[PDB]
Amino acid sequence: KLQDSLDAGVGNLVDADLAKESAKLQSLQTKQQLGVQALSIANQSSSSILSLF
Amino acid sequence: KLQDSLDAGVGNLVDADLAKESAKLQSLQTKQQLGVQALSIANQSSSSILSLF
């Protein structure tokens, strides 16, 4: 009985909640996809200078 | 496990960041296109002398 209590205590200390990690993973994947597109938008600046010359 | 650690370490040593290389490539391509036009502008100097004679 004591060993079961100690195992449960350590698990309570260091375990995670995967239900929350799923939501965080979804939001972060969407944000990374948006960040790549934002970098692509930022790269195409200064390309309009060539028309002046 | 140790072999995985060593491979990751070497990769950390010698790998590049392609997100930055994309931006640098765009800027350098634009600058080269502008440089060719600038050289073309510089060539056409001294062509106006012939009108004096």
A43 interaction partners in chain B (CB closer than 8 Å): 22-23, 26
A39 interaction partners in chain B (CB closer than 8 Å): 19, 22-23
CA distance, residue A14 to nearest chain B CA (Å): 23
In 3-state terms, what secondary structure has residue A36?
helix
Residue B17, token pair as written in the block: 């960041």
To the nearest 10 degrees (0 to 180), the angle between helices B18-43 and A18-43 is 10
Phi and psi at residue B50, to the nearest 5°: -60, -30
Half-sphere exposure (Cβ direction) of B28: Cα atoms closer than 13 Å: 6
**CA neighbor of B30 nearest in space, from A53, A46, A38:** A46
DSSP for residue B17: -
Q: Report the alpha-carbon angle B11-B16-B22, nearest 5.
A: 155
**Which of B22, B27, B30 is nearest residue A50 as measured by Cβ atoms?**
B30
Residue B35, token pair as written in the block: 């440089």
H-state helical runs in B1-53: 2-14, 18-43
Residue A35, token pair as written in the block: 């960040």
Which approach determined this entry? cryo-EM
